[PDB]
Amino acid sequence: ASYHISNLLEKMTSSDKDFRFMATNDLMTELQKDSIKLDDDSERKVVKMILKLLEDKNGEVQNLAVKCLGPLVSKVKEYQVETIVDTLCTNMLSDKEQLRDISSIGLKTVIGELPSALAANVCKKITGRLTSAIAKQEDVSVQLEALDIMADMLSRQGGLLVNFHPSILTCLLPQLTSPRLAVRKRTIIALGHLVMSCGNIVFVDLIEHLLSELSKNDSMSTTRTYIQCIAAISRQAGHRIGEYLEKIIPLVVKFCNVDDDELREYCIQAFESFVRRCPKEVYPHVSTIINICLKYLTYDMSWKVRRAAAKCLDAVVSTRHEMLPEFYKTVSPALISRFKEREENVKADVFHAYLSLLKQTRPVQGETPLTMLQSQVPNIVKALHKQMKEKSVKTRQCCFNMLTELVNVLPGALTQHIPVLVPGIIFSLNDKSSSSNLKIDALSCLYVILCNHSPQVFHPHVQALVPPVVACVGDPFYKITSEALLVTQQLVKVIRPLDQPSSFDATPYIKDLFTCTIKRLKAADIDQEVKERAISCMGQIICNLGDNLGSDLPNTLQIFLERLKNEITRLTTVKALTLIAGSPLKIDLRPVLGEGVPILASFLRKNQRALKLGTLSALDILIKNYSDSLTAAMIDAVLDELPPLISESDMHVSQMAISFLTTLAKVYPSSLSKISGSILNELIGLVRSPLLQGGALSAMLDFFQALVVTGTNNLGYMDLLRMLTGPVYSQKQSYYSIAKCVAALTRACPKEGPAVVGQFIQDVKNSRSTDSIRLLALLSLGEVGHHIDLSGQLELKSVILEAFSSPSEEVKSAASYALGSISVGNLPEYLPFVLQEITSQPKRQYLLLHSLKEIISSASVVGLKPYVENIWALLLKHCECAEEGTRNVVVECLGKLTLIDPETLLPRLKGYLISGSSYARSSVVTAVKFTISDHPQPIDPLLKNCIGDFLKTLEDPDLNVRRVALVTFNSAAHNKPSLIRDLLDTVLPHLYNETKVRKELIREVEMGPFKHTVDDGLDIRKAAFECMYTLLDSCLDRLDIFEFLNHVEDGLKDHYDIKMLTFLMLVRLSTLCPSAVLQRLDRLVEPLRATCTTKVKANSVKQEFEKQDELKRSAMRAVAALLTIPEAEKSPLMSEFQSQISSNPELAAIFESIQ
Template identity: 65%
Template sequence: MLIGCQNADHPTEEEHLCVCACVYRESEDEYSDDDDMSWKVRRSAAKCLEAIVSTRHDMLPEFYKTVSPALIARFKEREENVKSDIFHAYIALLKQTRPVIVAGADSMEEEEGPLNMLQNQVADVVRAIHRQLREKSIKTRQGCFSLLTELVLVLPGALDQHLASIMPGIQYSLSDKNSSSNMKIDTLSFLNTLLANHSPSVFHPHIKMLVPPIVNAVADPFYKITSEALLVTQQLVKVLRPLDSKSAFDYKPYVKSLYSCTVKRLKAADIDQEEEGFPILASFLRKNQRALKLSTLQCLDVVVRNYSGAINASMLSDVMKEMPPLINENDLHISQLSLNLLTSISRSHKQAMSSIQAEILPQILVLVQSPLLQGGALNAVLDFFRALITLNLPKLGFRDLLSKLITPVYDTRLSSGPIHRQAYHSIARCVAALTEMSPLEASNVVAQFISDIKNPKSTELIVLFSLLALGEIGKNIDLSPHRDIQNVILDCFSSLNEEVKSAASFALGNVSVGNLPKFLPFVLQEIENQPKRQYLLLHSLKEIINCESSSQTGVEILKSYVQTIWTMLFHNCECPEEGTRNVVSECMGKLTLVDPHTLIASLQQHLSDPSPLARSTVVTAIKFTISDQPQPIDPLLKSCIGDFLRTLQDEDLTVRRVALVTFNSAAHNKPSLIRDLLETVLPHLYNETKVRKELIREVEMGPFKHTLDDGLDIRKAAFECMYTLLDSCLDRLDIFEFLNHVEDGLKDHYDIKMLTYLMLVRLSHLCPSAVLQRLDRLVEPIRATCTTKVKAHSVKQEYEKQEELKRSALRAVVALLNIPDSDKSPQMNDFMSHIKATPELAVMYDTIQKDALSSGQETMAMDTS
């Protein structure tokens, strides 16, 4: 259909209006000619509109003015297949609206924004569709429910005023004897979405009509219908008696029927052979299905926490037996949920924990030594130890557990050999958790760690661990009674071991948090007086600011020191060492969160500083004010971030590079900050993707000449921004302009090629139609990568890099071939023939294709479960 368009990549308004007209049909009168073949035109037009809508996110407002009304008007289409395609086209329009809302809801609040335009058309959609919900055609009804489901997901609450029109259709599909199983499942699925995304009160006038067919569906012999109906029942209970509002609705007449049908399913012999659920749930933990294990652990945890009175130790014994194999580094999420369950059991059923020492605790201690332990899994370990120490179980007191934890650090004769460095951090946090729960033991433990640091016979690893442990303990306990602690830690700054120095910096900062009035002035004084130790001392200051700015109490304490710290930081913002400047920037950014209005204004003033080092420090500081969680600073940040991003036009290369890094952070963590600026920022971003010959130079190293590209880092930063924008701001991108720069990146340096191949895989999933139009041009640089041979006598690293580059290119090829109709490209077919004729490439391609297939199947299985 786009053959007649002047520019298929960018159809003009007039051109897509012509396509709309084909769908709309010139006459509003219904036609009756059985031989009428114009349905083919209308069907082609609908498919064409779906393709345009799917690829041109930037034209959404225009689509809602022209395409949407034309499609709504043709919901009455007589030909069933054409009607299905029209529904699909409208669903595509709704799906293109969803990313806009997810990525930046604030941008949708404009009067002419797609969201408001859709809101104004909801009545037209319902008017055009409600009668068709009672048609005999199952395909038509399924299309209607699919469209309404997408509408509700895009616009929650959209059908508040239209339920009276829709309810008869729902009742019809659930009650009609001729409805297929899939029809009932689709209806129940829509009803579930409808109930979850609207106010409970709007359903109260319709409850009498809704409950009987839902009760019948719960009793349906087909388990999939029963399952969907039970999900609807779950939502219906919340509607009948909403807990978050006072409702005068009389729910009592409906409780008995809902309760009876649910209990009947629970008692059914073909569903569950035992009313005793714990042995069955325990058996699920042995199944080789990850999703089932995750759901079972979550279920058990909820039951243990909420129904402890109905559970006894014997019921938990089967569950406890299944715990040891679940706790290991191979699956930290399962380990985390297992530890959460054990923590819940320890808090409500102490007697069930008597068997923990034999098998479960050794597994936990092994997990603590894993270099992979972090985040939620590590926090679950800490919570477990906090709960365990309060039980006062035999041989599991404070000293017993402390000994078990630190033995791998202090006993060098262990057959397993030295533990990973990361484990020292995890063990230190576990020791601090135990100490926090045993304050009477704290003084002696801290004294022992200080003694170990001072002892000249202590190994560097023991000193390292002791410093980390002091830091973790000092966060929550005031260690100032140990009068020489700051000097003992400071002496470690002179160590020849970099890890010990870093641990000392960490310890000084965190010990200071325990008593800020005593320790912070000492740290600030040392920063001014000890220039050689400045980098480490700034890291200590960073630890202080990070810890204190995360709590309201800490912020209040820190406020009295803000101006002193701020002045000191600006004294060091022009340090020639980039590492020191980065620490200064992080301190500035985190401190800005304490007093945003004053400190952001100060940062803005320094954007015009004559020193490029100072400008780069200030721009980097803004990066550290951005987080992925809502912050009070966000409105202020949104109003001023454009000033900081104007440094993308700075004359200094380093300033432009850090501006890109800051932009990338905003796009990744909080895209709403930069969405409205993209129109002005993107040209400067794309400008930095170009290779600049003036930044390429040759250096002589002995008899050899090496080429250095000083613009490589900034190009990498630019392409990293582009990759981020695909996830967060896709709807604001001109995909064809974007693809132009991706195409250039495929011919660039190794690092950039790797990035652009990743982008190509993402684009193949997100914008297949647009990529398909550029396929012939994209194949050529991919072919060049796969056919390039490493020069003779090259080092092993060059061969490995080239092999990895080929693998990345072939992953992109697999993704491209998954796009419908990609096999019709002559260039792609020719390239595939070359791959199959080259044994090395053929083997590599087959392996990658199998990996992609198995990965896709695994994802699908997880989604289904």
């Protein structure tokens, strides 16, 4: 306001503490809003008034005044803000000391309230005064207070004052030679922020000055501050000190050499922030230049030299993974484990330095790196016997964490070492010396041991282990109690061994282990993490220690029932009860199943999902093992809750519930009077569904197989066929699902004779009956006749074979299935018919062979072996090009026959290969292609020998042989390269050859007036190129990248179809090996020039344009990738190209397109 501010400014000096306080405070809330009304007179009075109160006798008015200036600046004049600084900057020089503290603190407050526009003018006035204040004219804390604000400025607004950078530097350099050690350390922090926000020219001025003065050696008191400086720069700048270091590291080695507690300590920690921030420098020097200095204690300031050396090793191990395998494990553990005692702080960093080494040894997700560690185990154990009985809490904690990591990385490695460790655990565990923080680690470690070892190793030690563990369960503090119970949970699995039988005394501890747990379960009045761990544990105690437990069990079970109703513990008690019910020690549950099952059924609608799956899985294993407790009421409670669970939305929830019903069906055939409502109805909500998985499908077939056997009302056999087929007797994708489902019902209850019969006359009556109906009819026959012996009603064969010639090709393709699948059920009968039919008439040759595939692809291996040589003879005869598929269908049976047994057939193919025909040689190599599998298969060792024999004598043949030979190489290099990685030396010479344009194979076959040139050797080249893409994923280990990038060039100017493939080879190359690419980056960009600049003749069509325009943008898409390269990218032609693309509009309208 105008008069209210003419009011406050009078209250602001009314000689009362309370007056001045509230006046400022009210003004401080008004300046922190949008601030209504401050005329150009207020600015010259309010700011004149604030500055006064920075000298008040009351300090609280001083506080409000200082905290006022900040939220005043972002709401006032450009000229007025300058005026403030000039006051504070002169107040730095100061008269009274009170002013020197409050003005310096005020200046910090202002420096924060700067966001980029006006903030430059603010800082420029300050920076000009601080530089003159940093000047050497002797002042203890006038130099200091100025240096303090200087750092607080460059961290926030160091981006501004770019033209003031070389002003600051040339005034901070001669302050490192100050009498006060304090100044030197204060200037380092100031320089810390400078090296960051500045650019090269002034960074170099520092580094060189720093180096040349180090070379000057001059003064000892400075040389130590001058090394401290190279340190803090490595922290702040990081990669900036990357370049200037080959010049640096030698001089600092020449100094940690020199006799001095002080300086040597300051060099090792400088050496740290070189291998901690710039993994470029690679030097083993630092390792050895620590090993010597890691033990400098003669017999007090000396200690710190070790600690700094330990830190470095830890930060050298934390980065390098290639230095671990051989190197570290022999040179460091021999010294780390050695120096495992000393003074607590160095010990702690030494310990830590082995943890980092153990961190590094982790699984990747002669001798392996861990076998060396396996050898090192006994020395560590020996060392840790001494350490684990230590007074210090922190030392012993590093011991347990050491083991905890060790046991996780190399499990079982603490087997022959247990008895010399346990006393150490038991000590720290129960004696008063510890903290909560420590025994909780001692427990965790004990747990981690118990899990990853044979329960046998602990047997003779359960004596000293149980007493304190059980005592820990009863600890006051909640975080210990849970971890103690989580140990107790495994202790029971150590007396149990119900995986493998083992005679061990159990009874002496079931008294103590039981009571301590229920005292924590019957509490209901402590932390909920304990409440749950008590249940998770007591589960395992009941599961295992049942036959030795008193009449406490049935009453405690009731406690599990009451913890089940709880909104918090339920899930924990659900799976705690899942494990009890399924224990081989068949323990009672009859007294809590009565009401338990409904309370369990209830959970199903709580949509917790996690609880849904947990309760289902318990319902399964509760209905199984106690199928005599179940009432008709219990069941009807569960069934009327399941309908929402069966739905395509969630396959796994559904398929767990279905397979629960499968369990129900088999164990209480009475109960299923009920599923005729919603349950069944929604079970077809999964069949018709176009996402029914092969897993969840077979989880449902078993359900039907177990449902029509029970003979429940409504759900008969001939009843359920119409619940599946009804839908498809009216008018997407899986009709199959409805067939192999209807099949399972037939083989269940054999009123099959007629059920199969109505299905045949449904294909004969193709009049009126649609493909939607004739299709499902066939596929179902195949699925029924797969297990049943269908050689009955000839309204079969000659009716299936009628659908071989249906208007709908959908029908033909599933008619082929039907024949093939039907034959499996009686192989001796159909197989010499189908073999016979193939030669018989070519009029059905193709579709018949495709039935033969399904006969190979499904027959008993016991019952197909008799006919193996016959099939082979028939397939050999048929490499006729009557069609081309005719061959590729045979060249897939042959293939799948080779899978069936390879010993006799794999070299048999190599036999026909030796000197075949133009089409028989095509058949043998493609057969061996369909032998190549994704995951390793029991055929592949015998393959890894023969693929040499194939490929080597397959690159030399001709025509459409090389095309296949190169595809078979591709597939091998792509699917399982361990067939090819050790054959690439002999093969690559043959490959690169097929990358050059065959001049003989270009032929002129012009149509009419316009002339046309075709390239026969295009697809052998287009296939050879797709190998060089394939070999770039797994096989770059065995490659001459330079000789490779020769051929990348050919196809950079080759056919449009190929240019594409190599443009994507570049983008991968410029990442997977940026080193070799840049060396040849000259003759990689000009072929990309040609592909870009050449404009299409404006008279041509819609496609002709875009087909070349999508081409243009795969060249740029490829230029972009060559740009992100280890920076030396500005080579002759490339720097030219960067101005060329920023000149052209259209050629910029392509770089714009993608990124």
